[PDB]
Amino acid sequence: MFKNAKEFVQYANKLKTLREKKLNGVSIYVCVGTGCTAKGALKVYSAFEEELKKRNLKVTLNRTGCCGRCSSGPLVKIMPYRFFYSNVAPEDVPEIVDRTVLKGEPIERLFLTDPLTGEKVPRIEDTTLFKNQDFYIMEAIGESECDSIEDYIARSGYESLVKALTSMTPEEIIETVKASGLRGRGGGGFPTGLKWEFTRKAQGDIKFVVCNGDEGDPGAFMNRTLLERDPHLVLEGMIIAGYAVGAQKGYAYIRAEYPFAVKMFKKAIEDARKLGLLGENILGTGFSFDLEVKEGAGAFVCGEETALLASIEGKRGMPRPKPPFPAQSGLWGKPTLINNVETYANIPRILRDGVENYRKRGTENSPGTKMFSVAGPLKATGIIEVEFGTTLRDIIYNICGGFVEGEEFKAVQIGGPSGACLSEDFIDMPLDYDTLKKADAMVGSGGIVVITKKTCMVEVARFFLDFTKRESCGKCVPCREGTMQAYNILEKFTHGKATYEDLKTLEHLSKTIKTASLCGLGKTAPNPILSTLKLFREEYIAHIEGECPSGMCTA
Amino acid sequence: MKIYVDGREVIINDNERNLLEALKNVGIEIPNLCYLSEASIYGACRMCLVEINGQITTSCTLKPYEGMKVKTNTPEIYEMRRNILELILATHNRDCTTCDRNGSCKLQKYAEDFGIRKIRFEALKKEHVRDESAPVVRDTSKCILCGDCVRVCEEIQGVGVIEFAKRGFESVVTTAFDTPLIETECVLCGQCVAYCPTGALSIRNDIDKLIEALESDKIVIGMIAPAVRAAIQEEFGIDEDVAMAEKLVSFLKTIGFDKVFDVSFGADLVAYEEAHEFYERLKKGERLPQFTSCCPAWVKHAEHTYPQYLQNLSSVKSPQQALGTVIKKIYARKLGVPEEKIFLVSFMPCTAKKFEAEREEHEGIVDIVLTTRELAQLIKMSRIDINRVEPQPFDRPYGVSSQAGLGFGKAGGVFSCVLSVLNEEIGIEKVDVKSPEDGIRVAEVTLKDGTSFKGAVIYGLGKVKKFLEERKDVEIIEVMACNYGCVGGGGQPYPNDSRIREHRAKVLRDTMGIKSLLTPVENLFLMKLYEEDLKDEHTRHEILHTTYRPRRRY
Amino acid sequence: HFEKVEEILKKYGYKRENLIKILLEIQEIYRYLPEDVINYVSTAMGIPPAKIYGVATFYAQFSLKPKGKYTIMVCDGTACHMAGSPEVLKAIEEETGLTPGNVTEDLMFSLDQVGCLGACALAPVMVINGEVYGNLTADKVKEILRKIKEKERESA
Ligand SMILES: Cc1cc2nc3c(=O)[nH]c(=O)nc-3n(C[C@H](O)[C@H](O)[C@H](O)COP(=O)(O)O)c2cc1C
Ligand code: SF4
Ligand code: SF4
Ligand code: SF4
Ligand code: SF4
Ligand code: SF4
Ligand code: FES
Ligand code: FES
Ligand code: FES
Ligand SMILES: [Zn+2]
C-alpha cells in the first residue's frame, strides 16, 4: 500500500475480510449527510454512542453518507439484517437498541413507508424507489463509511488507481475515457476525453488538476452529497486525471459554507497522503502528485472556469474572454484541467470496468447515469440517480413518489437559474444532452425543482433574476446593467405596475443580455424569462391586466 | 490578407491580434467603449459586435482568418448596441454641463450620435460615492467602470490605492472602505485623471478663488511653470510656439495681474542650491544617495513608503515653493507692501502642487495653484484670440532663467541643471549615460579633481521600487512621478498620452533652444538675489529649505 | 498588536494566493473583517488595502460588520423560496426590524440569506447560531424570535 501494489493487495484483502466480518457482526450506520443532520441525526449519533458506552455493548457504530431518502428523517441501518429505519429520533435510542441490536425484532413503526403502496417496507432494496433508480455512483447505500479510507479500500477502492499507475499508460487512460463517452456533468456536456487530450498535448512541464466542487445552482445539493459521501472516489478520479494529463498538483475547490464536505475531503487527502497514495512517489512508479483543498468564499460566478482560476489564485473571481482556454493557460498560465466532481467520480467507475459495460446505461450518445437532487412538494425528495434515458415523469412519480395531497404538477426547473422551465408538454422526453439541447432545455447541473399550481411563474422568473443580479460579477455592461434592469421590470410585473411596453422591453433586453454577455452567467441570465414567456405568456398577460392567476403575488 | 466586410473585399494586416484593431488600422471603425486611453483593455463594453457565420460575437476577441465574412452592421447588432448604450446611460449621472469631461467625452458623443433622446430603462439608484477631500476629485456616479484608472494607479504609478470593490450592480471603483482620498497613500499625481474617459475623476477647480482675489484690492502675482507653456496650445488646437509664455504674460496682465514671474527662475534657484547641497554631501559622504525633492508626488510617496530615506531627500524646496517664499519674504519687503497684501497664484501642470501648496510646512506662501487646464479655461472664458496676443516678457526681477532651469519641465531637467551648476563651478570631464530600461537613465560623472559619482533619472513612479531594490551604486536619484516628467502631469490638457507628451517635450526643447543663458550662475538676477537677500546660511535655510515627516495611518 | 493574525499570516507565509484562506480565518476569529485588521494584513503581506478590500467585498462569506450575538441565516434557494422563505424574511423584518445583510444596533441579531442548505425537504428552513428549522411560517418565526428574546431577558 506504501511503495508497491503487492503490499497494497495484501492490505486490501485484509481490509476486505475485516469489512465482511463487520457486515456479519452487529453494527449501526447513522446517515450523517446534510438533510439528515438537519433533522437531528447528530443527536441520534450522540444518543447511540452514549447508550453503547453506558451499556458496555464490539458493535461498530459508524457514520455513513446520504442514502437518498433525506425526506425520511434521520436514517439508521442495521448491518447484519438491513432494517434501515427512518425518522429515528434521539428520544428512541433505548427502544431501538434493546429491540433490534439484541432481540432482533423488527420495529414496524420506524421503518420506511412507501408512498406508492402506502406500506412500511422493511428494507430499502425492496422499495420501489430504490428499484426504479439506477445506482452506479451511489454504492453501499446506508452501509458505507464516509470518514475512513480503510472502508473505501475494503470496498475495492484505489485499485483502479493501481491499474492506472502500473498497468495502463496516460495515453490509454485518456483513450479509454474518450471511447467511454463520458461528458462533463457540470452542465456543459463537453466530452471529457477531448478536454483531457487538450490538457495533455498542451505545451508545458507543469500542469494542474482542478475539481469544481460548486453545485452551479443555488437550489441544488448533489455535488455536495457526493463530496460528503465518498471523498476518496473523487480523490481517486482526480489522481487518475493528474497521471493521465501529466499533472503534479491538483486543487479541490469547495465552498466554505459546506463545512462537512470540506472536512471530509481534507481528511481524505490526509489519509491518502499517509498511505503514500499521494506524495513524492506513489507505488514506486516515479509519479508524484499532491492535492489541496481550496475553500470558496462564496460567489456563483466562481463556477465559471476563468473566474474559478482567478479565485484560486487569491483574486476577485472575475472571468475573462475564454480564448485562450484554461486547458492551454489556466492557473498561473500553466495548462489546467477543470472538471466537475461528478466527472471525477465517473472516472474510477469507468476505469473499473470496460467501455462496453459502462456504455450499457443511458443512450447511444449519453452513456452512464446522472445524480439529481429533487426538491419541492413531493412524497419523496432528495438525492436520486437514474440512467440517461429517463423522462421527468419517471423521476417525479416512480422515483420520488409524486405530489403531496392537494398539489399538482405545474412546472419543473432542471438547472436552476441557468436551467430551463418545463411545462407538462416536455415531461415525456428522456433526459439527454441532445434531446433537450435542441428542444430548448437541458439536463443542467443536476438540481431539479417541481413547481405546483400555487406558484406564479412571473414570481419564479423574478426570483431567478434577483439571484442573477446579486451574483453578476459586474465586469461587462450587458450582464451588470441588464440583469438589474430586467429584475426591475419583473418586480414591476409582480406589483401590478406593468404594461405591454414593459413586456416588449423585457423581451428585447433578454435577447441583448443573452447574446452580448461576456461569460456564461450573463448568457444564461435571461433563460428563465425566455422559458416562462414561451410556456406561460398568459400569466404575464394576466399580471398586466391586473390579476395574478395564482394567489401568491400580493396584488 | 483577404477578408470580407459587409460583402466587400478588405485587405488587412497578415498578423493582427483581433478583428477590431485590424479593421481600425485599415480604416474601418466599430463603435465601442473599451478603447478609451493607453491603459485600456478589451472585453467589457460588449458593443463591438459583429456577425460571422451567422453568429454574433465581439470583434475585439476575434482572431481574423482568411476569407472570413463579417457583417459589422445588422438590425440585430443595431438593437444590441443601442440597448447597451441605453443601459450605460440609464444609470449614468447625466449632468454634462458641470462635467470636467464635457466636450471631450466619448460617451457624450455616442449619446449624440445614437439618437438617444429618452431613457427607456430606469435610473435605478446606486450607492454613489462622492469625494472632494483632495485636489483629485472622485464622483462614481459618472464612472463607467472601464478600469483604466485602476491599471494606471497600480501598474504605472505603483501605488494601487484605488480598486474595484463589491460586485454586480453595486460594483464601484473606490478606495479601501471608501476612505477620503486625502487620507490614503494616494500621491495625488493625477495620472488616473489624465487617463479617465469620463468626469468620474477630475481636478478640483479653483477659478472662483482667483476671480475673488483679482476683484479685491490686494496685489495678485502669478508665476508660470516650465511645462505649462509647452502644452497649453493643445486646448486651443493650434501649433506650438516658443512665444507661448509671453503671450500668457500679456493675457494675465490684461485680466488684471500685477506681476507675472517665471517659475523657471525658481528652478534655477533650486538647482543652484541643490548642487551645493549635493556637493557637500559627496565631500563628507553623508546622507547618500540624494533624492531630488522637486516632485511633490514623489515626496509624499517617500513619506508613505520610505521613511528611512526621508533624510536622504534633498532639503531644498521645490521651484514653486522656493520662488513663492522669495516673493513673500523678500520681494514683498522690496516693494514696500505687507506680505498679507500679496495673493500668489501658481500655474502648474500638476495636481500634486495643489497639495504641496497646502502643506503645513508651506502654509500661506502660495495662495492658489491652478493647472494648465484652468488657465486654458480663463483664456477661453475671455474669448481672446490668444494666438494673436502680442507677447511681452516676464516681470523683473524673477522673469529670466537659464535653459537649464526651463528644462525642469521634462524628466531629467533638474539633474541636467545640477550637472550644469557643478560643471560651471567644478568642471566635469565626461558623462557616460546609460538606459537600463524605458524610463531609467543612469549617468556616470567624473569631475575635474576626481570624486566621480553616478546619478539616475527615473520618471514614472512604480519604476522606483525595483530600481531602489537593485542599484546601490548611485549617489543622486531624480524621481518624477509622471511619465516623461511634468509635460505629462495630471493637470495637463486632455487627452494626455505618450505621443502628446513626447510632442510637449519637443516643444519645451525648442523653447529652451532660444534661451541665451546656459547655466544658473549666468542668471544675473539670481546672483543679485543671492548677494542681496540670501547671504548668510541661516537666511538661506529659512527661505529655501523645508522638512519632511513620515506618513502612516492608525 | 494582533498576535493571532501574525500567526495566521506566518502559517500561510504572507503568500498572495492564500489571501482568501487568511481572510476566512481572520473572520472566524473576529466575526468580521475590521479595518485595522485589513490594514495590518495589507502592511504585513505587502498588499495595498484597496486590493484586500476589493477581495473582501466580492465574496459572500466575508462581512464588514460584526456578526450578531444570534446570527440568523435563512435559506433562499429555489425550494425554500417557493415554500415561503419571503414570508420568513418579512416576519423577521417586522419582529426584529432588520433587512438581510444587517445587524441590530444592540448587536443581538443579524440577518443574512444563504443558498440551499441541503434540507429542502423541510423547506422553508432557517438557522440561528447553527440550530436549523423547517416547515417554518411567519407565526412560527415570530414565536421563535419572541422566545429567544424572552430568554435573553432572564440574564440581565
Ligand atoms: C456561473 C457558472 C457557474 C458554473 N458552475 C459550475 C459548477 O459549479 N460545477 C461545474 O462542474 N461546472 C460549472 N460551470 C461550468 C464550467 O464553466 C465548466 O464548464 C465546468 O466546470 C467543466 O467541468 P465538466 O467537465 O464537469 O463539465 C459553471 C458555469 C457558469 C457560467
Ligand atoms: S456576464 Fe455577468 S458574470 Fe459574466 S463577465 Fe459579464 S458581468 Fe461578469
Ligand atoms: S462623463 Fe460627463 S460629459 Fe460624459 S456623458 Fe457623463 S456627464 Fe456627460
Ligand atoms: S492621483 Fe495617482 S496615486 Fe492617487 S489615485 Fe490617482 S493615479 Fe493613484
Ligand atoms: S473612474 Fe474613470 S477611468 Fe476609472 S473606472 Fe471609472 S470611468 Fe474608468
Ligand atoms: S512629475 Fe511633475 S507633474 Fe508629475 S507629479 Fe511630479 S511635479 Fe507634478
Ligand atoms: S443525507 Fe441522509 S439520506 Fe440524504
Ligand atoms: S471593444 Fe469593448 S467588448 Fe469589444
Ligand atoms: S432550497 Fe433551502 S434547503 Fe434546499
Ligand atoms: Zn403572480
Q: How many CB pairs under 8 A join B and C?
A: 37
Q: Are B25 and B69 in contact (CB under 8 A)?
A: no
Same domain, B181 and B72: no
Same domain, B356 and B427: yes
Centre of ligand 3 from the C-alpha of residue B84, in Å: 16
Of B99, B121, B143, the domain-final residue: B121
Give me the number of domains chain B comprises.
3
CA–CA dist A511, B81 (Å, integer)? 12
Q: Are A218 and A192 in contact (CB under 8 A)?
A: no
Site to probe by mutation for ligand 2, drawn from A470, A477, A518, A527 as the one with most ligand atoms within 8 Å of Cβ, is: A518
Residues 6+ apart with CB under 8 A from C102: C65, C110, C111
B487 φψ region: left (φ > 0), alpha (ψ -120 to 50), beta (else): alpha
Q: Which helix (H) or strand (E) holds A67?
A: none
Report phi then psi at B397, rounded to 5.
-95, 10
CA–CA dist A69, A130 (Å, integer)? 10
CA–CA dist B358, B363 (Å, integer)? 6
Best CA proximity match to B479, nearest among B314, B347, B330: B314
Cα dihedral A546, A547, A549, A553 sign: positive
* Helix segments in A41-162, DSSP class H: 41-55, 93-96, 128-132, 149-154, 159-162
CA–CA dist A197, A173 (Å, integer)? 10
Of B60, B86, B121, the domain-final residue: B121
CA–CA dist A337, B195 (Å, integer)? 38
User: Which one from B293, B314, B416, B420 is the annotated catalytic residue?
Assistant: B314
3-state secondary structure A488-535: HHHHHHHCCCCCHHHHHHHHHHHHHHHHHCCCHHHHHCCHHHHHHHHH
A189-197 own/partner pairs: CB under 8 Å, 24+ apart: A189/A433, A189/A437, A189/A442, A189/A443, A192/A339, A192/A343, A195/A327, A195/A337, A195/A339, A196/A241, A196/A244, A196/A245, A196/A337
Report phi then psi at A470, rounded to 5.
-70, -35
Same domain, B419 and B398: yes
Q: Are C22 and C12 in contact (CB under 8 A)?
A: yes
Q: Is B153 annotated as a binding-site member?
A: yes
* Cell, residue A253: 475547490
b/e map A415-448, b = 16+ CB within 10 Å: bbbbbbbbbeebbeebbbbebbeeeebbbbbbbb
* Cis omega (within 30 of 0) for bond into B393: no
Angle at A183 between CA A182 and CA A189, to 5 degrees: 170
Q: For chain A, which chains pass the contact test of at least 3 CB pairs under 8 Å?
A: B, C
Pocket of ligand 8, beta carbon within 6 A: B 20, 32, 34, 42-48, 58, 60
Contacts of B168 in chain A (CB under 8 A): 469-474, 480, 483-484
* Cell, residue B493: 490638457
> May I ask the CATH class of domain A363-452?
alpha beta
* Helix segments in A181-258, DSSP class H: 192-201, 222-229, 231-244
CA–CA dist A415, A225 (Å, integer)? 17
Number of H helices, E strands in chain B: 20, 19
CA–CA dist B352, B490 (Å, integer)? 8
* Number of other residues whose CB lies within 10 A of the CB of residue B296: 27
* Helix segments in C13-84, DSSP class H: 19-30, 35-45, 49-56, 78-82
Q: What is the DSSP letter of A148?
A: -
B76 is in which domain, residue-wise?
1-121
Extract the annotated binding site of C for [2Fe-2S] cluster. Answer: 75, 80, 116, 120
**Which atom of ligand 8 sits closest to the CA of residue B59?**
4
Residue A483 to residue B168, Cβ atoms within 8 A = yes
Centre of ligand 1 from the C-alpha of residue A236, in Å: 20
DSSP B297-334: HHHHHHHHH-GGGTTTB--BPPHHHHHHHHIIIIIHHH
CA–CA dist A165, A179 (Å, integer)? 20
Residues 6+ apart with CB under 8 A from A391: A427, A428, A429, A430, A431
Residue C50 to residue B160, Cβ atoms within 8 A = yes
Interface of A with B (CB under 8 A): 299, 301, 316, 318, 320-321, 323, 469-478, 480-485, 488, 505, 508-509, 511-512, 515-518
CA–CA dist A459, A467 (Å, integer)? 12
Q: Are B355 and B300 in contact (CB under 8 A)?
A: yes
Q: Which helix (H) or strand (E) holds C131?
A: none
Residue with cell 476671480: B211
CA–CA dist B317, B270 (Å, integer)? 7
* Cell, residue A401: 413518489
Residue of C nearest to A413 (CA): C78
Same domain, B188 and B214: no
CA–CA dist B353, B296 (Å, integer)? 7
Second CATH level (architecture) for the domain A457-545? Up-down Bundle (1.20)
User: Which one from B154, B277, B424, B444 is the annotated catalytic residue?
Assistant: B277
DSSP B183-197: GSS-----HHHHH-S
Same domain, B66 and B141: no
> May I ask the CATH class of domain A149-357?
alpha beta
Same domain, B374 and B461: yes
CA–CA dist B172, B163 (Å, integer)? 8
B12-18 own/partner pairs: CB under 8 Å, 24+ apart: B12/B64, B16/B64, B17/B63, B18/B42, B18/B59, B18/B60, B18/B61, B18/B62, B18/B63, B18/B64
Same domain, B52 and B89: yes
* Cell, residue B245: 509664455
* Cis omega (within 30 of 0) for bond into B495: yes
Same domain, B156 and B244: no
* Number of other residues whose CB lies within 10 A of the CB of residue B61: 18
Residue C48 to residue B167, Cβ atoms within 8 A = no
Of B98, B121, B144, the domain-final residue: B121
Residue B49 to residue A480, Cβ atoms within 8 A = no
Same domain, B190 and B227: no
Q: In A213-346, which ranges are E strands?
A: 249-255, 290-296, 336-340
Centre of ligand 8 from the C-alpha of residue B71, in Å: 16
What's the start-to-end Cα distance of chain C, in Å?
33
Q: Are A507 and A436 in contact (CB under 8 A)?
A: no
DSSP B56-73: EEEGGG----TT-EEES-
Extract the annotated binding site of C. Answer: 75, 80, 116, 120
CA–CA dist B390, B248 (Å, integer)? 10
b/e map B251-282, b = 16+ CB within 10 Å: bbeebebbbbbbbbbbbbbbbbbbbbbbbebb
Residues 6+ apart with CB under 8 A from B58: A321, A516, B20, B42, B43, B46, B48, B49, B50
The dihedral formed by the CA atoms of A385, A389, A395 and A398, expressed in degrees to the nearest 10:
-100
Q: Are A456 and A405 in contact (CB under 8 A)?
A: no
Residues 6+ apart with CB under 8 A from B510: B240, B242
Q: Which resolution in angstroms does this entry have? A: 2.3
Centre of ligand 6 from the C-alpha of residue B451, in Å: 31
3-state secondary structure of A108: coil
* Cell, residue A315: 483574486
Same domain, B72 and B215: no
**C136 CB near ligand 9 (under 6 Å):** no
Same domain, B481 and B513: yes
**C114 CB near ligand 9 (under 6 Å):** no
CA–CA dist B405, B226 (Å, integer)? 8
Q: Are B349 and B489 in contact (CB under 8 A)?
A: yes
Q: Which helix (H) or strand (E) holds B19?
A: helix B19-25
* Number of other residues whose CB lies within 10 A of the CB of residue C146: 11
Approach to solving = cryo-EM
Same domain, B394 and B537: yes
* Cell, residue A458: 412571473
